[PDB]
Amino acid sequence: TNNEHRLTQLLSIAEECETLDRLKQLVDSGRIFTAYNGFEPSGRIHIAQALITVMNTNNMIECGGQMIIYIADWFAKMNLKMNGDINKIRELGRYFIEVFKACGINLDGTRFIWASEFIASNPSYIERMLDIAEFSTISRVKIFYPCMQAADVFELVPEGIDICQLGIDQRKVNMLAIEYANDRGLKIPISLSHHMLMSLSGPKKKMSKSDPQGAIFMDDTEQEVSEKISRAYCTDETFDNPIFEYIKYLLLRWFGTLNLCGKIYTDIESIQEDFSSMNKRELKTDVANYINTIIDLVREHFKKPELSELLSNVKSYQQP
Amino acid sequence: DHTNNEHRLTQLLSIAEECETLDRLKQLVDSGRIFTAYNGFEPSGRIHIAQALITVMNTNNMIECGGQMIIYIADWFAKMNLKMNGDINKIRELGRYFIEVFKACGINLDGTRFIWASEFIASNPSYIERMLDIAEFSTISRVKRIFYPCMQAADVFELVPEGIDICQLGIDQRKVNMLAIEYANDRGLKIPISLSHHMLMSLSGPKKKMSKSDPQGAIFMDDTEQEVSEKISRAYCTDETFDNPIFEYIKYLLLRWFGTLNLCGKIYTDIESIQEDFSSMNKRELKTDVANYINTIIDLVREHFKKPELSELLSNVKSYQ
Ligand SMILES: N[C@H](CO)Cc1ccc(O)cc1
Ligand SMILES: N[C@H](CO)Cc1ccc(O)cc1
Structure with a gap:
């Protein structure tokens, strides 16, 4: 029954979940699992993003998981945020991190990964991007932004992240990741999406x-x-x-x-x-x-x- | 007169066994404007005397003909290719080794600039986007009828803002430059010029x-x-x-x-x-x-x-x- 509670909890945060089945198996297996969320630093942080990120993170941990917070500074630059200044983008990323801390994010089960540093250290990450982009292109045959983010759930950790915890407005990305995983015989990522305030x-x-x-x-x-x-x-x-x-x-x-x-x-x-x-x-x-x-x-x-x-x-x- | 440009054209061609169109190279030389060339390599445990001397000779010739050389140290790719089992620290150390060898052999630093891949990739998002765009072109070309080539092909377009003028590599890597040329034609970009040298x-x-x-x-x-x-x-x-x-x-x-x-x-x-x-x-x-x-x-x-x-x-x- 303990796995029943753990399950209801993890589902309490989501408005949508890619098959409760897959999530049920992960919870039942009783094995440590990983979840992640990513964001591009910006001038200001919405109270919704700050609190939801903290509550969801702290909940994953309590439910027996490990959380990965992906700071997409590299992507922010690519999207010309802060007019492309990486040093301003990074300061903003640190500001976001300090806000999560102030709000009580559980650092014991949370790890922060920076895009710019991760990309420079893991060539497979970029390779994954290319392969997903190929899958996408060949599929539609009968924009890269999606393919690039879709690679995150498969590369942030060796065995691939178990749960992608993002806002419901990011639906298209996790759907691609799922399509891809099935067409490549990889572990299928579990989607846990929250309501957009x-x-x-x-x-x-x-x-x-x-x-x-x-x-x-x-x-x-x-x-x-x-x-x-x-x-x-x-x-x-x-x-x-x-x-x-x-x-x-x-x-x-x-x-x-x-x-x-x-x-x-x-x-x-x-x-x-x-x-x-x-x-x-x-x-x-x-x-x-x-x-x-x-x-x-x-x-x-x-x-x-x-x-x-x-x-x-x-x-x-x-900004602030 | 035009004689100086004839010597410049002749000197640039002497380093190559193959050249993708003399026409494009002549225009560049005749334009009289400063131009850029690049050569890239993955650090390795040992360096062939061939690579050392040819890189130094070609580089010094480029500069002497009014060009600027960019030497691309593909440490990032070396790791992806598992050189030294993927240890990045040894790779970069070897990269420095190669550079000291080029210096020992007299490469002209006043017209040479070194760029490391790991750092370039982390600072330039457009570089990766280029790889993706080239990969789409190459995929659509086949469907209208292995990503390593699309990745290296982005180099000539991104190493510098306006794109590198001359790709100076060993002839064994002609397929990559040819992809870049096809790609460049389809997307209406400056066509890269290849000056490929003989492999010993x-x-x-x-x-x-x-x-x-x-x-x-x-x-x-x-x-x-x-x-x-x-x-x-x-x-x-x-x-x-x-x-x-x-x-x-x-x-x-x-x-x-x-x-x-x-x-x-x-x-x-x-x-x-x-x-x-x-x-x-x-x-x-x-x-x-x-x-x-x-x-x-x-x-x-x-x-x-x-x-x-x-x-x-x-x-x-x-x-x-
Ligand atoms: N692209 C999103 C907002 O613009 C932030 C993001 C979400 C998930 C990621 O894996 C990466 C970035
Ligand atoms: N791939 C080559 C040797 O294996 C090295 C290289 C050559 C040119 C580049 O732009 C990058 C790497």
Whole structure:
């Protein structure tokens, strides 16, 4: 039954999973397994990315796994982020790492790998890219970005990563990796994808466009968080409601217990039932207070004198 | 006048056995603009005297003709190919060894620039993208009817921003340059020019192949004076110039390197006279002179590695044996 719990846990983080079957076998085998997540450093880190990465990582470990955090600095450069400056990209990568630390990521079962350094040390990684690109091309016969990332799950570790833990918006990549693995008789990577937090501006709004307002960043001050929550789209229904989304995907999971509008909640079911009748101004006040408590971990972490250099550089890049 | 450009064109062509179109090379030379050339190699435990001298001679000629040489140290590829069992530290150490040998033999550093693959790949994402794009071209070409070639082919396009003008490699690597040329035509890019040099035959025979199987088939920059004498003494040698490795060493290495050769009691300054007198030369006495001239060249390296600053490199390379 212990393997049943471990299984329900790992599945609690995902909105989608490539065959629960394959995941069930891995959990049942009872053997140490590996999972990974990657990101391209950028000017600022969304609260969603920071918290979800930390919760998922800490969960993998507790469930008997090892986590690999892939810092795709090389790819960020290739995608011209930070106008291609690798030194700025790397500082940003370190900033992200420090944010994960401040938030409690479990370093005992977590390893950080940098793309630029990994690529220079493992030619097979690039070879894997070529082979996947060949598979893809020949397939469509009857863009490389996908093939390049698809190689990650097979090369980050000798036997190949067991679980690819990414956002649901990365679906196409892990699907290719699975197609490829089957056509090459390799171990099939297990996909564990999480929900993509919606914009605070509402369903009619996009994302990353006018993003400053549409999302909370780990560098936002207390006043900025409160103002972004005040402006956020919010109706009396839970569907397409960013306030309900932040509560469900971030706050309840992070804190376990929430005191909302004078009532204590320990499960999303009860919050959903009372949602329509909650005074929304009071709810927003509580939501912003809980969010600010989380970000305070980062604010306090970066007060350490040893991180002043990092902090100053990050701010200058028109970032935190 | 145009005469200077004629000499420049003629000098550049003298280093090659094959040239992908004289037309493209003439235009480049006539343009009068500074141009770039590159040569690449994977570090190895030992370095053939052929590679050492030819790299130095070709490099110095390129520069003398108004060009800039890029020497690409393929350490990354050496590891991928498992040289030294994949140990990157030994590979780079050997890479430094090769460089000190080029320097000992007088390569012109003022017009030469070294670039290591491991570092280049980590700093230039476009390089890898080029490999992928070339691989797609090559795959679609077949489907319209092994990635190692597509990988090396990217070199001429990425080593420098505007792409390298001249690919200067041994003729045994013509397939890679030809791929690059086809690729370049399809994608409308500057067409790379190849200037491929002759591959020296094995001292063991015209049919024998180069391999760690018989280290006697070639002279290495680490061979001792007694060792070269023995290797030359035992080398295959008939009275004809064809299928003769002794003749090849004289033609492609000695005459070009020294300009004047005293062989079997006679002075030679051109290959035709050597060829006409070859059959009647006492071969045992010829081998003596050939071995002596070769040892004079290697003495440059032996002396170079006596410097105290290189005692470290020396010891390391020696241990890798
Ligand atoms: N490409 C993603 C965001 O742009 C980040 C990423 C995700 C997974 C990887 O294996 C690598 C990078
Ligand atoms: N592949 C060659 C010998 O095996 C070495 C080489 C030649 C040219 C390059 O651009 C790279 C490596």
